[PDB]
Amino acid sequence: MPVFHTRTIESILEPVAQQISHLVIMHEEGEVDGKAIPDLTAPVAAVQAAVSNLVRVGKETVQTTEDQILKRDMPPAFIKVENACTKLVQAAQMLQSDPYSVPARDYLIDGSRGILSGTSDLLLTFDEAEVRKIIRVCKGILEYLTVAEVVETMEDLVTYTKNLGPGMTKMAKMIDERQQELTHQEHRVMLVNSMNTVKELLPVLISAMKIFVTTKNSKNQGIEEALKNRNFTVEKMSAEINEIIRVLQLTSWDEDAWASKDTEAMKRALASIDSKLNQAKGWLRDPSASPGDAGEQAIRQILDEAGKVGELCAGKERREILGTCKMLGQMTDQVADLRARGQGSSPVAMQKAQQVSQGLDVLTAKVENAARKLEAMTNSKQSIAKKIDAAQNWLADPNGGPEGEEQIRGALAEARKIAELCDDPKERDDILRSLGEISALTSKLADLRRQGKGDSPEARALAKQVATALQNLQTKTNRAVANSRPAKAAVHLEGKIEQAQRWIDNPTVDDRGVGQAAIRGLVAEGHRLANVMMGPYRQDLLAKCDRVDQLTAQLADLAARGEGESPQARALASQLQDSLKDLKARMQEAMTQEVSDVFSDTTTPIKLLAVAATAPPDAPNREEVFDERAANFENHSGKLGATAEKAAAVGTANKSTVEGIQASVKTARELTPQVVSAARILLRNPGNQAAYEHFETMKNQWIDNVEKMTGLVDEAIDTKSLLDASEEAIKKDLDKCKVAMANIQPQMLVAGATSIARRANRILLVAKREVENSEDPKFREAVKAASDELSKTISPMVMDAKAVAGNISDPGLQKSFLDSGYRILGAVAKVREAFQPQEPVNQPILAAAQSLHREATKWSSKGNDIIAAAKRMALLMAEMSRLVRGGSGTKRALIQCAKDIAKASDEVTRLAKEVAKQCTDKRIRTNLLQVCERIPTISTQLKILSTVKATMLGRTNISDEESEQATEMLVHNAQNLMQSVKETVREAEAASIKI
Template sequence: MPVFHTKTIESILEPVAQQISHLVIMHEEGEVDGKAIPDLTAPVAAVQAAVSNLVRVGKETVQTTEDAIMRRDMPPAFIKVETACTKLVQAAQMLKGDPYSVQARDYLIDGSRGILSGTSDLLLTFDEAEVRKIIRVCKGILEYLTVAEVVESMEDLITYTKNLGPGMTKMAKMIDERQQELTHQEHRVMLVNSMNTVKELLPVLISGIKIFVTTRTSQGKGVEEALKNRNFTVEKMSAEINEIIRVLQLTSWDEDAWASKDTEAMKRALAQIDSKMAQAKNWLRDPHAQPGDPGEQAIRQILDEAGKVGELCTGKERRDIVGTAKTLGQLTEQVSELRARGQGASPVAMQKAQQLSQGLDVLTGKVENAARKLEAMTGSKQAIAKRIDGAQSWLADPHGGPEGEENIRALLGEARKIADLSEDPKEREDILRSMGEIAGLTAKLSELKRAGKGDTPEARAKAVANTRPTKAAVHLEGKMEQAQRWMDNPSLDDSGVGQTALRGLVAEGRRLANALPASQRQGLLGKCEEVEHLMAQLAELAARGDGDGPQARAVAQQLQDTLKELKGKMQEAMTQEVSDIFSDTTTPVKLLAVAATAPPDAANREQVFEERAANFENHAGRLGATAEKAAAVGTANKSTVEGIQAAVKSARDLTPQVVSAARILLKNPGNQAAYEHFETMKNQWIDNVEKMTGDTLLSDFVQNLTGCIRSIRPTNDRHAFKCNLLVLVLCFLVNKKFNACMEMCLCVFLQVCERIPTISTQLKILSTVKATMLGRTNISEEESEQATEMLVHNAQNLMQSVKETVREAEAASIKIRMDAGFTLRWVRKTPWYQ
């Protein structure tokens, strides 16, 4: 199948597809209307010349390239294109003698399809070779990052910086050129974000190495903390470069069915494990290697990554991976302790090192197996998602044809794959039981439809029983909507989704109440209990068959009113927590800086530092927890929530590094390198926290903040000050966001507009490919299904892009009204495409 993930490939394939589509139309006119095909000698000669030129350039490239994979993959593509071109020439010659020749028409279609497919293969092989060039540069940087572990003098640091700089510049330039070439906006964003992170971390890395070198050479204190800072930055940069390598190899993007984040997290963990394994094995093989060396750090990183994978698994598999990682961690401690005592070459130490080495291999195998299973399960879930709409349409249509039944059979096949992969016997049994029920209902419904009884009450009951249940919502607004649907019609069987949403809201309310003062806690808990009581009443009435009666309607109305009050109290509680925590985010880190720079003769210097370090860590933890709660309780969209979660994770990772940098400064008073390093780490932490708090405060949850603040009646000057301070912070953030609003709107609007012509071109190419397969007997069923699937998905992506363009255009046309009486509006300018 053709691929067009770069603008170059697309620009070459598009005119080829255009010409082939004309040939297909002429072929169909001859087949259906009996028209003679005109003389094609001239256009086919032009195609032959273009193909010959492409093959010649390809062969010259193969002769000079050192890429063994390219030398292997190019010849089959050459043969494919040349064979197709020969068929096309033969077809033109035969049609010149007999414009009605059936064999010539077959040659015409087969040759056209072969040229399009072969040209795509050639271009893809070229493109893959270019990607491998970039990956080689990225891997070179990855390897050179590990050299940071042996930099022990300022001369080494100068040499290291001089060597690293050009490589980083080259990688950044290649990534920038590559992202501009890509047609998938999502891939471009991922590459740019990862590359920007690497650029931001580069000065942090140099600062970390510098402070390590200065403390080590001056026999100063804090070498261990400096080592942690340096290793942390190296790991972060390595992870981002590995992510760049992964994204570079992607060639497709489905708007609706992208692989789950768990699968991608497992792949990243596997890449990290693979990159650290050789270093870990070298440390284990050397009985004289010291504890704390990079090799031991590599082992601990491998175990950490394996633990992350284990947390993503379930049941026995999770226990197995997590338990193995824990056991190997204990074994690592034993080996390290023996080597610290100088007994690394003893038989016991050698045996334990061998056991640890073998255990790492076993653990890696388990992690790889878990990743394969999760990827297979994700594939099955995506296949189900692609067919579910067709199945639902068939269930809703009383006169639906057999294709809907085929969709359901395919769904059941994918469900069986998921059941086979499940480690939980109960879960497997539930899936198989549901499959049996669905298969039985589908068979009966098919019989009724074939008998012309698809619109009878019995058939409608079968269709409703076969309908997919709604998945429980995660965030506040989603739960409110699901609860509202159930309250509007409690007699309708929604598989318990509405009541589950209500219970989730109550649980969230109680969790928020636990953090409130006693005076406010009782009010929120009382509303939670009232909602629970009314829900139980309504559920009981529905179970008795009185869900549509006057009593049920009265209870439902009372429940709706109480639920609104609960939502208001939850938002009020969350607003108060945000105002308490976010009103001052940087004072603890500033106090930590003051403690770290205290004069050596200051009283209780170290004790004060430890207290302020603990306060800073506690404050950072509260910031992250509050941001996560605000994201969960609020109505923020998915991208905003993910941004908050990423910023929280980054801030949590940086917090201990800031403390380590501060401790280095404390132990080395007056050291300029230590001061500069601490400032670098501190500023990076502040930047992350500002992003985290800014996204949280400006999420959809805080759109209702004005009303919540008005409802708060400050009882003293302290509360009034906090409330006013929060409003000032919000005003600053809103002003900052709106200053960038014009640029952001333009950027997003251009991106969605750009996707329409891009996907339209791709749809045209895929339509041509599919057209060359119609009625052909020499096409495999798998190839035909793949072409159809790609065509359908591309059409869906095009429709989604059109919807997004309409939405963004509507957003750009909104008039902003102000209390002062002024009105701001967007004025249409000349469109970008004219």
């Protein structure tokens, strides 16, 4: 396949392309029409003149490198381009034979083709080994991780600190040229952040090494914390390298790393499975004592996360997951409505308590399968990748007659068979075409004996046979999982909505079971955003959950109505998309309630953790309250971090932000269990004030994180939605003064007033860090003035909090608290003023009808150069797939109109370049940086692949099974194209408000 994994191959084959572009244009009308020839042999000389630099590299690097694995393929590539160069000049001599030797003119189609069939594989083998000069370096650094592990020597650690010293200048700069090897995004952020892994963790290693230097003394008790944290470092270091090892292994747009990006959200899912499961068994321990307005969080949250495990499976059992989520909760919602009086008698409900919980534990058997249906399957991709590169070791045998190499050809063949026969629960019919490849490769085991006559050179054809018989293994192994995985709802906002969208856009022909799960997410978080509130507002949104889903379920029924669509299918689908547009804003408001309640008072238990770290814990009651403050500190980490993941679920933050908030979530998920553990280190160190003062650092080490993570999850949503619920939260608490005055409770009074400071410091925080992201400075001055008003007014409240608490029975002073009070109400929404941005219908039309409007909506006029280019975008999008379903005499406009795609997509680049320079916000221009390099690279790659399928066409006896690989490459890229292009359309308006 024509690969693009190295910019050399880009900067060589695009020089190949535009001269190849007018080459095979001459072939079609010389064969279909039989035109007169143009002058071609000197262009035939000129296209191999482009090769003449490359083939000089091609002749000399074979002479330069002794590398026999490179000699196994690169000279057979060098012969193959020479085989093309023969078929260059054999054509060119037959070009010079007659100007109408049309059977001799048949060779002309290979000249664009066999070159690009070759120069891919030619530029492969260099960059096959170019990365191999880098692979073992960082691998050796990974194998240097165990150097100081067994060794307990300080000066050896000092030399190991020198083993990383020039160890760094091997691991830094070549990787730093590797991130300059691609000026891409699609793997470069996988590189450069892993490049931050090797630099940040390196002194963190040395610190952890110096932690183990604090184990050189014997009588201390750090003999375990040194082991686990040095393990913790080297697992993180082995993570990111082996990642970017494989990120340097691949060659194009992949599928398996996405399925490898699913393995870890399984872990936060399965941890969320047994999170409230014990509390659900505790709810099962007494169902008689629950109102079901907040105790169902122990119940209904467990239901919700298994649905995403159902997003990590397929088949009929994936239908069971919606078949249990739309049922067993309604099996519990009826017994919840049996508690509207209590008329479902819980002494009588022993049969019912099973039937409301029968959707739980059978689903645990479903999710442990759907784990291991996906666990071993994504493991199988690397498992086959072991053995197919272990036949390379069989291929790189210098055994000329392999009578001794008769075992590696067999056991690996028995290894890849059973591993793909472990892939039997994927699909039953395609396991026969696996056996069809097995029945091929069993003969390819018996291929390898005629080269057994001391025959290493003439081995090469039957080596090329079993190479291509392995090149036939790869696509089925690629098909072993690409069907079995639904393309996941891209966990940001529209990337779940658009995957919810396009399943409605095509009822007859469908994806790989994807869209029946790809719509399921918008109700999967809908049941989560409806979850945590009380009685009446839960059923406010669950009606918008289950009935707007029921509006969608009519579109699921009408596949039986005829096939695909009904005659009335465009009735219920045309109002379906705005039925779910009701669902989005009531999921947003459900979310933006779930943030201003939980974050802006989270450090208040920390202060109560701090103030009960002063009073003696050697007491039965005062320590447990602190430990229930610690159990409240347990509760924050969920209701922050899950809501942070819900702020990742709906909050339209930046991709690097929803990287960075998710990265901060990781810091939230790891430093929350440590500072509660360092609280226990405090409660067990006997009178140690230094460790207490070190806990003072370590609590501050968590605060500034979670204060930044506040300010980052403040930026995970619009603050104009945050301060709505914040301006009501003070109104939810200013009244609590009026009952505090009604009784004698100054300590309940200041508890609100302290929380005002817990509110206003966060409100101080946001107007500070709006400024750094803003680039309209004449309007950030009030934002600069916002916390400035707030900083001067946070203090007299705390003065007045001390004032009224002296004697709450003092009227006037009672009024003074309100006199201090509603300046804050006059200030809190005044901050939001900055964030307030004031300063017979037809069934065969959609997937072409909704394809046009999906980037032609939003009603924009200034960026019409986006939109007018977006007109040719979706038009030629399906017209590609129309023309790849074209006849044999259609290869002219095949390449030609799809060469126009790249320059259209390079106009998509130049508009992303247009917006990014006039972008007036720093954090959102990172997604301009995460768009402005994605577009132009993959653009001309289509212009590459525009040529290839045209050369696949017009042969009329070619092997179509690889020509249809050029079909599905046109499927694959244009999918990746159209996905990011509509993103490039919509994110323009996501930036256009900022200026």
